[PDB]
Amino acid sequence: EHAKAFLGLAKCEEEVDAIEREVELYRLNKMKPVYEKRDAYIDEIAEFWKIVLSQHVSFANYIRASDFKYIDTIDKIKVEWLALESEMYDTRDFSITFHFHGIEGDFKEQQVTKVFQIKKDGILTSEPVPIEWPQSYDSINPDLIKDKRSPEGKKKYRQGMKTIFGWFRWTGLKPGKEFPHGDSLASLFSEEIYPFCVKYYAEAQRDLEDEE
Amino acid sequence: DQENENEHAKAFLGLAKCEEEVDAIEREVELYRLNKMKPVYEKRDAYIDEIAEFWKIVLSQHVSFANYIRASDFKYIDTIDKIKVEWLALESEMYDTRDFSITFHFHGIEGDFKEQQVTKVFQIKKGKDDQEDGILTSEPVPIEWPQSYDSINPDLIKDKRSPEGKKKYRQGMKTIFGWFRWTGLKPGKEFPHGDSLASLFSEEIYPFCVKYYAEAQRDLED
């Protein structure tokens, strides 16, 4: 028994999913103007992103220690939700653009955009995007390493692919063969870091305020 | 740096205003969701009423609900055969999007617990200064306690100041029935975590009961 009720409940849950979709699209549309206005003010604050990325708890766990030298050069982060350009896109789909100020003689100033899209629930996927790795990473650079057959050549390949730079060539299509948990890192940016960066910034001052 | 510190000040003022706009947007979005969902909840709840043991299964399925009350109370929680939540913000914009009334119907137990319908109201309140999103508060609402709970019933205990009376008193206030007189305005003197329990209902149990029920029915197979 209860079959009739169960079928009805299944249809109701479908209606709920549809509403959630409409609600999120409504929110994304309303937020676009506010984010633009907000980001313009952020661009006026020196080490904003440096401070935010160092304030986020789990972010640091996704990358290597030696990466913070370059992460600290991030001067701008902009996320754009693809669903605002067309349906066919999940509301979780987005492009994220980073601007690195660089480091004289080691890491060049550059702007890199990576696109994340849901594929079937569902999982994020992406296409590799070019990024010039720090000169300091030549020994662990996948495109450079000559002969990754030796025990050290493999160690170095693994070390480099686990850096934030390895994340840029992540696709989510070869589980176990790419930067670990690239999809979770992406979600960190679109769901936490970009939307609530100001709150992280305020918390960073608050924290350094209690130590005062 | 009179220009930069001024730029930072301008920036901070600008950001504070942006957050205010975000807060306004969040409310507008939530009102839209609640209005669209109201009709779906009514239809879904009508199907739920055709499944007699639905709520008993859902409530035993939730991961933390059980942590709020004595295992002893489940005899009575098992008689709940209807739960309906209504969001107050839909009736007036003076209500916070988190404000709601929850109505329970208990089938009862012969000679011990009367069949009855009870509605409790929860509304946000703030203390000012600190960002404080505010906390939930409520007013006591009448419910007829089980006859067997006579000795721990707050309104029947004569002493409740003596060693044994105080113990019996505290036991009763920790039951689901004690939760009905919770208000959130007398910390340490009421049903423990009455506020978190109320949120469990409006944010988890009522909205996702069907997912909990399915998960429970799924564990009966394989």
Curated annotation (Swiss-Prot), chain A:
Molecular function per GO: acetyltransferase activator activity; chromatin binding; histone binding; identical protein binding
Inactivation phenotype: Decreases acetylation of histone H3 'Lys-9' and 'Lys-23'. Simultaneous disruption of GCN5 abolishes acetylation of histone H3 'Lys-9' and 'Lys-27'. Abnormal protein sorting to vacuole.
Subcellular location: Nucleus
Taxonomic superkingdom: Eukaryota
Major localization listed first in the record, in broad terms: nucleus
Signal sequence bounds: none
Any one GO cellular component localisation term in the record: nucleus
Keyword terms of this UniProt record: Nucleus, Phosphoprotein, Protein transport, Transport
Keyword Nucleus: yes
A biological process term (GO) from this entry: protein transport
Family to which this protein belongs: Belongs to the nucleosome assembly protein (NAP) family.
This protein's domain notes: The C-terminal part interacts with the N-terminal part of histone H3 and promotes acetylation of histone H3 'Lys-9'.
Job of this protein: Histone chaperone which acts as a cofactor stimulating histone H3 acetylation by RTT109. Preferentially stimulates histone H3 'Lys-9' acetylation by RTT109. May also stimulate histone H3 'Lys-56' acetylation by RTT109. Assembles nucleosomes (in vitro).
Subunit-structure text: Homodimer. Homotetramer. Forms a complex with RTT109; consisting of a VPS75 dimer contacted by two RTT109 subunits. Interacts with RTT109; the interaction is direct. Interacts with ASF1. Interacts with histone H3/H4 heterodimers and heterotetramers via histone H3.
Miscellaneous comment: Present with 3120 molecules/cell in log phase SD medium.
Protein name: Vacuolar protein sorting-associated protein 75
Organism expressing this protein natively: Saccharomyces cerevisiae (strain ATCC 204508 / S288c) (Baker's yeast)
Record gene name: VPS75
Residue window of the full protein shown: 10 to 227 of 264
Swiss-Prot record, chain B:
Domain-related comment: The C-terminal part interacts with the N-terminal part of histone H3 and promotes acetylation of histone H3 'Lys-9'.
GO cellular component: chromatin; cytosol; H3 histone acetyltransferase complex; nucleus
Family under the similarity heading: Belongs to the nucleosome assembly protein (NAP) family.
Single GO biological process annotation from the record: protein modification process
Function field: Histone chaperone which acts as a cofactor stimulating histone H3 acetylation by RTT109. Preferentially stimulates histone H3 'Lys-9' acetylation by RTT109. May also stimulate histone H3 'Lys-56' acetylation by RTT109. Assembles nucleosomes (in vitro).
Cystine bridges: none
Other comment: Present with 3120 molecules/cell in log phase SD medium.
Deleted gene: phenotype: Decreases acetylation of histone H3 'Lys-9' and 'Lys-23'. Simultaneous disruption of GCN5 abolishes acetylation of histone H3 'Lys-9' and 'Lys-27'. Abnormal protein sorting to vacuole.
Covered residues, full protein: 4 to 225 of 264
Compartments where located: Nucleus
Key words of the record: Nucleus, Phosphoprotein, Protein transport, Transport
Organism encoding this protein: Saccharomyces cerevisiae (strain ATCC 204508 / S288c)
Main localization (coarse): nucleus
Any one Gene Ontology molecular-function term assigned to this protein's record: histone binding
Subunit structure: Homodimer. Homotetramer. Forms a complex with RTT109; consisting of a VPS75 dimer contacted by two RTT109 subunits. Interacts with RTT109; the interaction is direct. Interacts with ASF1. Interacts with histone H3/H4 heterodimers and heterotetramers via histone H3.
Protein name (database record): Vacuolar protein sorting-associated protein 75
